[PDB]
Design an enzyme around this catalytic site. Structure first.
Site, PDB file in Angstrom:
ATOM      1  CG  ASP A 162       1.798   9.713  -5.224  1.00  0.00           C
ATOM      2  OD1 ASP A 162       1.074   9.464  -4.260  1.00  0.00           O
ATOM      3  OD2 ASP A 162       2.991  10.002  -5.077  1.00  0.00           O
TER       4      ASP A 162
ATOM      5  CG  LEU B 291       0.249  -2.000  -1.504  1.00  0.00           C
ATOM      6  CD1 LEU B 291       0.441  -3.283  -2.307  1.00  0.00           C
ATOM      7  CD2 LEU B 291       0.574  -0.810  -2.390  1.00  0.00           C
TER       8      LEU B 291
ATOM      9  CB  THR C 181       3.500   2.588   5.794  1.00  0.00           C
ATOM     10  OG1 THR C 181       4.411   1.761   5.064  1.00  0.00           O
ATOM     11  CG2 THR C 181       4.144   3.995   6.142  1.00  0.00           C
TER      12      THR C 181
ATOM     13  CD  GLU D  91       0.090   5.781   6.369  1.00  0.00           C
ATOM     14  OE1 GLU D  91       0.157   6.578   7.300  1.00  0.00           O
ATOM     15  OE2 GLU D  91       0.823   5.853   5.385  1.00  0.00           O
TER      16      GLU D  91
ATOM     17  CD  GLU E 107       6.953   6.334   3.119  1.00  0.00           C
ATOM     18  OE1 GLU E 107       7.698   6.102   2.155  1.00  0.00           O
ATOM     19  OE2 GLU E 107       6.061   5.569   3.481  1.00  0.00           O
TER      20      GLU E 107
HETATM   21  O1  LIG Z   1      -1.492  10.756   2.097  1.00  0.00           O
HETATM   22  C1  LIG Z   1      -0.159  10.613   2.549  1.00  0.00           C
HETATM   23  C2  LIG Z   1       0.837  10.260   1.438  1.00  0.00           C
HETATM   24  O2  LIG Z   1       0.239   9.278   0.569  1.00  0.00           O
HETATM   25  C3  LIG Z   1       1.120   8.714  -0.436  1.00  0.00           C
HETATM   26  O3  LIG Z   1       2.235   8.073   0.179  1.00  0.00           O
HETATM   27  C4  LIG Z   1       1.987   6.947   0.991  1.00  0.00           C
HETATM   28  C5  LIG Z   1       2.249   5.736   0.061  1.00  0.00           C
HETATM   29  O4  LIG Z   1       1.378   5.721  -1.065  1.00  0.00           O
HETATM   30  C6  LIG Z   1       2.113   4.480   0.900  1.00  0.00           C
HETATM   31  O5  LIG Z   1       2.543   3.395   0.140  1.00  0.00           O
HETATM   32  C7  LIG Z   1       2.973   4.552   2.159  1.00  0.00           C
HETATM   33  O6  LIG Z   1       2.709   3.415   2.919  1.00  0.00           O
HETATM   34  O7  LIG Z   1       2.693   5.737   2.924  1.00  0.00           O
HETATM   35  C8  LIG Z   1       2.967   6.933   2.196  1.00  0.00           C
HETATM   36  C9  LIG Z   1       3.075   8.084   3.204  1.00  0.00           C
HETATM   37  O8  LIG Z   1       1.955   8.231   4.063  1.00  0.00           O
HETATM   38  C10 LIG Z   1       1.710   9.812  -1.330  1.00  0.00           C
HETATM   39  O9  LIG Z   1       2.679   9.264  -2.213  1.00  0.00           O
HETATM   40  C11 LIG Z   1       2.369  10.854  -0.477  1.00  0.00           C
HETATM   41  O10 LIG Z   1       2.840  11.876  -1.279  1.00  0.00           O
HETATM   42  C12 LIG Z   1       1.384  11.391   0.560  1.00  0.00           C
HETATM   43  O11 LIG Z   1       2.104  12.281   1.366  1.00  0.00           O
HETATM   44  O1  LIG Z   2       6.165   1.756  -5.114  1.00  0.00           O
HETATM   45  C1  LIG Z   2       6.404   1.068  -3.896  1.00  0.00           C
HETATM   46  C2  LIG Z   2       5.440  -0.100  -3.720  1.00  0.00           C
HETATM   47  O2  LIG Z   2       5.692  -1.060  -4.771  1.00  0.00           O
HETATM   48  C3  LIG Z   2       4.746  -2.143  -4.789  1.00  0.00           C
HETATM   49  O3  LIG Z   2       4.858  -2.884  -5.998  1.00  0.00           O
HETATM   50  C4  LIG Z   2       4.896  -3.007  -3.507  1.00  0.00           C
HETATM   51  O4  LIG Z   2       3.939  -4.064  -3.510  1.00  0.00           O
HETATM   52  C5  LIG Z   2       4.695  -2.094  -2.263  1.00  0.00           C
HETATM   53  O5  LIG Z   2       5.032  -2.792  -1.079  1.00  0.00           O
HETATM   54  C6  LIG Z   2       5.568  -0.796  -2.353  1.00  0.00           C
HETATM   55  O6  LIG Z   2       5.173   0.149  -1.366  1.00  0.00           O
END
Ligand SMILES: OC[C@H]1O[C@H](O[C@H]2[C@H](O)[C@@H](O)[C@H](O)O[C@@H]2CO)[C@H](O)[C@@H](O)[C@@H]1O
Ligand SMILES: OC[C@H]1O[C@@H](O)[C@H](O)[C@@H](O)[C@@H]1O
Length: 500
Positions: free
Chosen positions: A95, A377, A336, A374, A180
């Site tokens: 983010d 990482l 995910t 999805e 989520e």
């Molecule tokens: O673009 C959708 C969302 O992306 C990020 O969240 C992901 C996250 O980074 C990933 O690890 C996980 O697997 O999926 C989420 C949700 O899709 C942002 O942090 C979210 O704010 C966005 O909505």
């Molecule tokens: O912030 C959450 C993320 O932390 C990372 O260090 C892990 O490798 C990811 O599996 C997890 O989604």
């Protein structure tokens, strides 16, 4: 070979429309969505941030930057998966842009702190509204799901032209952090670090009271929350709750975990009921995102999953309970962790990615739901694409049919300059080729039917009978039968546009 076609979607920059509802990067995006279709991508996915649109006030919706963005997409010929993003951008991994929830909601919060998930110390997590206030009418006479549903009704009224022509094919109603269905149990914000167990985020006065009322219902008023569950960065062994033969197995701890994990089912049920009667009748599909909490999977307590809200054990399927609740709504699961392989996770994490993908996709396929993935990482390697392809078609290509099990579609994270440029670009393209079973991109594939109405509401105890007994996974091949090849794949080496 069409039965084996799995749709690829790319996720747009976190800020497809900038930090203050101003669609700015349009020319960049125009050039960035140019190569994506040359790659043969089926469509894209963007967040429709609640903090950008009703930011300015109750029912003051500004769909403007968003009508323009989708305009670009429609023009590119892409399908669009829109995420009803009722959560803060900023706090999690990846983010960069920071978009909080509506300032006027955050102002309600100043008066009542308990509207945000609260940990044991009493720390207020500002990124999503606690599921306790779902039905609490305190957002100036509006309850949080009323707010969530008015936000989606407005999205339909204003985006109708895109919903009719079939550009918007999937609405992904967000229900927690990162959108989520889960609790903010691993908040990088509050000084949790992987592979920490996390904490139980259920201390605000609304849930704090749902539970005491629930405790007395079963004859045990006296009961409180787990005193022995440790802290964010502990490891199971270190806590008396998550330790082998710990309180997570006691009557007090099984009950707690049943409560905590049920709250998330119910939350997602309520809001999906509504998203369904909003989009009721549309050529769209409703989905939810379930986290992939793989650390501590290999241990008995599955600690990280239990704190995150998924009550999953060796003898209790915590992801088939969720899919059973999605079943009436004709909803689908969007999991995910598809690109990981157990091999790549730190050995002390006690992480089992592959085994979580197999559990969730199997619970979902068992509940007759379409499942989609999805990656979790940033990954640009063939290994990542081959693991994905493996998970897409567990059993591989069935040229003699359509396969038993197959993912509805994959949505890659994320669009960047790096993805559409050079090496990473020819890999992504050959990855997409293979995800389509090497067929050419087809848009008239997986046509949806006008969203039916959610079937009869079924009690908690009726969705909870899918947990027991945990069934065996669907035999997953170990590698895909149609890998990336290597660097190149069908057309050769493609070379073109940079960024400016
Ligand atoms: O673009 C959708 C969302 O992306 C990020 O969240 C992901 C996250 O980074 C990933 O690890 C996980 O697997 O999926 C989420 C949700 O899709 C942002 O942090 C979210 O704010 C966005 O909505
Ligand atoms: O912030 C959450 C993320 O932390 C990372 O260090 C892990 O490798 C990811 O599996 C997890 O989604």
């Amino acid at each position: 070979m069409k039965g084996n076609y799995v749709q690829v979607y790319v996720m747009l920059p976190l800020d497809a429309v900038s930090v203050n509802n101003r669609f700015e990067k349009g020319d960049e995006l125009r050039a960035q969505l140019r190569k994506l279709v040359e790659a043969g991508v089926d469509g894209v996915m963007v967040d429709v941030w609640w903090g950008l649109v009703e930011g300015k006030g109750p029912k003051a919706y500004d769909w403007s930057a968003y009508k323009q963005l989708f305009e670009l997409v429609q023009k590119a010929g892409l399908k669009l998966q829109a995420i009803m993003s009722f959560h803060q951008c900023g706090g999690n991994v990846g983010d960069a842009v920071n978009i909080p929830i509506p300032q006027w909601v955050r102002d309600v919060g100043t008066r009542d702190p308990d509207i945000f998930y609260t940990d044991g110390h009493g720390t207020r997590n500002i990124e999503y509204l606690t599921l306790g206030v779902d039905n609490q009418p305190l957002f100036h006479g509006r309850s949080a799901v009323q707010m969530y549903a008015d936000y989606m009704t407005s999205f339909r009224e204003n985006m109708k032209d895109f919903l009719d022509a079939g550009v918007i094919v999937d609405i992904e109603v967000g229900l927690g952090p990162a959108g989520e269905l889960r609790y903010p149990s691993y908040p990088q914000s509050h000084g949790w670090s992987f592979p920490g167990i996390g904490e139980f985020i259920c201390y605000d006065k609304y849930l704090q009271a749902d539970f005491k009322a629930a405790a007395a219902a079963v004859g045990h008023p006296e009961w409180e929350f787990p005193n022995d569950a440790g802290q964010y960065n502990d490891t199971p062994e270190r806590t008396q709750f998550f330790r082998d033969n710990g309180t997570y197995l006691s009557e007090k701890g099984r009950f707690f975990l049943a409560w905590y994990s049920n709250n998330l089912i119910k939350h997602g049920d309520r809001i999906l009921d509504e998203a369904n009667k909003v989009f009721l009748g549309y050529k769209v599909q409703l989905a939810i995102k379930i986290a992939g909490v793989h650390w501590w999977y290999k241990v008995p307590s599955h600690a990280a999953e239990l704190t995150a809200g998924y009550y999953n054990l060796h003898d209790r399927d915590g992801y088939r309970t969720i899919a059973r609740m999605l079943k009436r709504h004709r909803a689908s699961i969007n999991f995910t962790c598809a690109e990981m392989r157990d091999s790549e996770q730190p050995p002390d994490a006690m992480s089992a990615p592959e085994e979580l993908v197999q559990q969730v996709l199997s619970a979902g396929w068992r509940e007759g739901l379409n499942v989609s993935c999805e990656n979790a990482l940033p990954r640009y390697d063939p290994t990542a694409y081959n693991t994905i392809l493996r998970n897409a078609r567990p059993h591989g290509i069935n040229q003699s049919g359509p396969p038993e099990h197959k993912l509805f579609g994959f949505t890659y994270l994320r669009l960047s300059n790096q993805l559409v440029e050079g090496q990473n670009y020819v890999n992504f393209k050959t990855f997409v080729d293979r995800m389509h079973a090497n067929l050419p991109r087809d848009p008239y594939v997986d046509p949806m039917a006008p969203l039916p109405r959610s079937g009869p509401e079924i009690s908690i105890e009726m969705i909870l009978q899918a947990a027991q007994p945990k069934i065996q996974p669907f035999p997953f091949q170990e590698h895909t039968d149609l890998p990336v090849g290597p660097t190149g794949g069908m057309g050769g080496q493609a070379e073109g546009p940079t960024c400016g």
